[PDB]
Amino acid sequence: MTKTSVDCTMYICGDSTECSNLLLQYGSFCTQLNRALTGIAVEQDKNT
Amino acid sequence: LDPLSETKCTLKSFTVEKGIYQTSNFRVQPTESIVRFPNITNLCPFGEV
């Protein structure tokens, strides 16, 4: 499968430090998502 | 300061295993903030007042 790379935050808002306050003040869900997509990536390096 | 202190932040761990570790995404600085209206053509003849 395609191994992605994601610039999560900047998608999530795109160049607003104010955002980054709101997001770290929302949590680290984008972080869990990155770990998920690194796990995908390693899983299919391993698959191949 | 340092890319490796930042990876250590990402690890949460002092201690670093062999591997490569994705920390952040780089980010290209804004420049020369510009606002460029078009060619100006036809304005008020205020002198006529």
Side-chain angles (χ1 to χ4, degrees), chain B residues 16-41:
Chain B
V16 183
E17 271 311 355
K18 171 284 178 178
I20 54 195
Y21 299 100
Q22 201 294 305
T23 62
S24 98
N25 299 260
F26 83 28
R27 148 78 45 177
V28 87
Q29 299 299 348
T31 112
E32 310 154 307
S33 178
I34 233 161
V35 301
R36 296 173 107 280
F37 276 76
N39 248 95
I40 272 49
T41 69

Side-chain angles (χ1 to χ4, degrees), chain A residues 6-23 30, chain B residues 25-28 30:
Chain A
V6 180
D7 190 347
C8 312
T9 70
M10 85 83 94
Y11 180 101
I12 296 166
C13 88
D15 312 0
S16 151
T17 177
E18 328 90 299
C19 285
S20 47
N21 326 83
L22 319 180
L23 155 71
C30 50
Chain B
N25 299 260
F26 83 28
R27 148 78 45 177
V28 87

